[PDB]
């Protein structure tokens, strides 16, 4: 039996686009029924890294399961986790991806953050995150205290450091900022660690699955 994604791409479904009313997922499927969409499924404009690879690796799964990798109200205590934007509306109210969190300053401060997850699900864990890019420098200072920020995601098989790019842009969906989306597969027992002093679109919910 297929995974019925209805009106939604796999991008918007896997990231948790608010407008995807599409049914919460099954435990397995042999293929995916989806609507390709011009604007991907990214309610906030940006670039989805390795989208083609993720699409074919999600074509057939065995033990799919969505779970809360970093609880919203405990993982980021002295950051702000309640950011919403008009470009990701839900029933006419501003919202955000249901699988990610837009971390910004709290009380004018964005302290160095660090968090780690150990894959005890006895299967591969699909972690997704984003990197945000303001359009001017003073706005990078507003929401993140730091001007030259960094994001570092490392596991035993994955390691990359991200730096924001501040540039004037055209408005896509009324927005001049950008969020680039990234993902990796965590093998059982492996640890993934997130480090940043700004611009991280932190993972909130992740997925455990078995391809095939």
């Amino acid at each position: 039996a297929p995974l019925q994604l209805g009106n939604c791409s796999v991008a918007g479904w896997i990231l948790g686009n608010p407008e995807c009313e599409s049914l919460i997922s099954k435990e397995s499927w042999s293929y995916i029924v989806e609507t390709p969409n011009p604007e991907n499924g990214t309610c906030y404009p940006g670039y989805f890294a390795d989208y083609e690879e993720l699409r074919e690796q999600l074509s057939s799964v065995s033990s799919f399961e969505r779970f809360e990798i970093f609880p919203k109200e405990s993982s980021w205590p002295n950051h702000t986790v309640t950011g919403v934007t008009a470009s990701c509306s839900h029933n006419g109210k501003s919202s955000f991806y249901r699988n990610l969190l837009w971390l910004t300053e709290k009380n004018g401060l964005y302290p160095n953050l660090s968090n780690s997850y150990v894959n005890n699900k006895e299967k591969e864990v699909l972690v997704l995150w984003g990197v945000h890019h303001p359009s001017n420098i003073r706005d990078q200072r507003a929401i993140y205290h730091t001007e030259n920020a960094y994001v570092s995601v490392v596991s035993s098989h994955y390691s990359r450091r991200f730096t924001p790019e501040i540039a004037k842009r055209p408005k896509v969906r009324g927005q001049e900022g950008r969020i680039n989306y990234y993902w990796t597969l965590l093998e059982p027992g492996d640890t993934i660690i997130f480090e940043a002093n700004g611009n991280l679109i932190a993972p909130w919910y992740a997925f455990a699955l078995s391809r095939g």
Binding site: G83, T85, N107, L109, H133, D139, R141, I143
Partner: protein, 231 residues
């Protein structure tokens, strides 16, 4: 849980320089916040003075600007305001306050497009005058056998001839709060202020319970604890 506290002289000579400082607790001055000064002249509304962001520069009310300078000091974790060439028009209650960061482009979550002043200090009073400071004289307003309301009796404190404003009065070191009213001050033709503070107490307690009013005149570094006993 950021909290602010103004401090500075309550009296400035005409054409002198006003100098105030706002102490910050539960937060850091090295932030993206807009540390803000606001004042209220007597009988007038709120007036924006200026703002500063650490690493982001300053922004002033054009009506001032020439005489107003706002700066920070990360070491002592406070920001300050200096207003030169003061006149009677600069007499006001000055407030420090915190304005959270805001965004200028379509790159941030929605809350960074709202302006509001999140935290406020309690305000400090600055009067511009050439007259000299004067501490107050405190006299009892003792209750008498005619001055009673049955089970209730009114007693008070007369705070006389002080300058400048303000004066605050508590009773029994703050242990007595219910039924307390401190009146606004009168300005006499001598230029000196006077006010009263009254508290209603059980008249059956007049011979037993001790009653002391605590007068505070920070604009002369004076505290007076005045015992009030029956006539």
């Amino acid at each position: 849980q950021v909290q602010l506290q103004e401090s500075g002289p309550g009296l400035v000579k005409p054409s002198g320089t006003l100098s105030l400082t706002c102490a910050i607790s539960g937060g850091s001055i090295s932030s993206s916040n807009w540390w803000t000064w606001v004042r209220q002249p007597p009988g007038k509304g709120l007036q924006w003075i200026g703002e500063i962001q650490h690493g982001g520069g300053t922004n002033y009310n054009p009506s001032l600007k020439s005489r107003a300078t706002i700066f920070v000091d990360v070491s002592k974790n406070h920001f300050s305001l200096r207003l030169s060439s003061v006149t009677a028009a600069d007499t006001a209650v000055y407030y420090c306050a915190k304005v959270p960061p805001y965004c200028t482009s379509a790159s941030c979550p929605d809350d960074y497009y709202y302006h509001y002043m999140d935290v406020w200090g309690k305000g400090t009073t600055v009067t511009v005058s050439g007259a000299s400071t004067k501490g107050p004289s405190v006299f009892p307003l003792a209750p008498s056998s005619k001055s009673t309301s049955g089970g209730t009796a009114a007693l008070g404190c007369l705070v006389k001839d002080y300058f400048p404003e303000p004066v605050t009065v508590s009773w029994n070191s703050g242990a007595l709060t219910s039924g307390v009213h401190t009146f606004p001050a009168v300005l006499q033709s001598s230029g000196l202020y006077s006010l009263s503070s009254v508290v209603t107490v059980p008249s059956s307690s007049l011979g037993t319970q001790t009653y002391i009013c605590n007068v505070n005149h920070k604009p002369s570094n004076t505290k007076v604890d005045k015992r009030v006993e029956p006539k």
